[PDB]
């Protein structure tokens, strides 16, 4: 299952 | 400041057989940025329809890719791989050597 990033950089 | 010098390896999939068909591979590796231009020459003459594999990168972040096309060895019919990368001041051209 692919990760879903949080706060952008 | 965004790169690393590409490594090239030209070779046929199946052991080279004069006249007999065969696939020429150009394995480019150790490069970054992932912008690269690869050509396969047949007597200095660019070879059309040259397949590009899907790109991928190692845990050291550099990318690798497999350029490839169908060919056929023949005593004097010379082949090669030509690469241009924003990491080298000039394109690198490596020639196939059936014994490698």
């Amino acid at each position: 299952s692919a990760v879903y990033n949080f706060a952008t950089m | 400041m965004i790169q690393k010098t590409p490594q090239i390896q030209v070779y046929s999939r199946h052991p080279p057989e004069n006249g007999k068909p065969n696939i020429l591979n150009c394995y480019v590796t150790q490069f970054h940025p992932p912008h690269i231009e690869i050509q396969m020459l047949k007597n200095g003459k660019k070879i059309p329809k040259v397949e590009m594999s899907d790109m991928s990168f190692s845990k050291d972040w550099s990318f690798y890719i497999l350029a490839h096309t169908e060919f056929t060895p023949t005593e004097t019919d010379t082949y090669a791989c030509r690469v241009k990368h924003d990491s080298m001041a000039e394109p690198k051209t490596v020639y196939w050597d059936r014994d490698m």
Binding site: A2, Y4, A7 | Q9, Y11, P15, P33, D54, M100
Partner: protein, 273 residues
Amino acid sequence: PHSMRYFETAVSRPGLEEPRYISVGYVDNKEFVRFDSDAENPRYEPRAPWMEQEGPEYWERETQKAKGQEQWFRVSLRNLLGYYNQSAGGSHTLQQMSGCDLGSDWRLLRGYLQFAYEGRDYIALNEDLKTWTAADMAAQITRRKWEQSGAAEHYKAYLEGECVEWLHRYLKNGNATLLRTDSPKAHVTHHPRSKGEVTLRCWALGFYPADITLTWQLNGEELTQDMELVETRPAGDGTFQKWASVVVPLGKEQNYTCRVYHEGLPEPLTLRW
């Protein structure tokens, strides 16, 4: 010692084109999924036969996640141009490695979440899945930002949960395929590469997985004092090739032995010219 990894990449070039986003998934170093924004119909795709066991809803759910990562990357890419006061004129690359390691006991051993900018380490979730390590001044900005929003707990949740749960699933449907092998078919060539000297080349072809070990040895200790060994390489058909040679005095060629180590091979291979 299983593992799951998602290698994502975003690259921007000058032009009206949005950056190219690429995501490759790995189960035990074997590619099983992949998404490329440059495709006619951007959608995660099966790259291992055991993944076709998954239904349409799985592929949609993943494609949507890709869609969002693509925006997260193109946005992040712009913030970094800012942080680094870079000129919008060249190209730039943003990379991420994510996933988790498992012991054969199905037990989680470690989580991974790190990023690279222009090919250099940028920011990384430490092994405690709580603190960050920032490479440079720019990264300090992202570190501060992810600390205040509590980013780590989020990725931490993926690493100890989703990553572990889904990796068990794949291993379960794919152990069949995963455990497979293709024995290397070795042989040795003779090349007059000198006078009073010759070059023997040992070959290992059509093997799989890529792991393999070749050795030379004029009966006794091994040879590394003149042995050449190219990097293992793909045949293009799913298997790989590799070779190693050594200079030998003409007439003794037949006296050198080559050993090939691969696990698809019931035992080590021994070969002579």
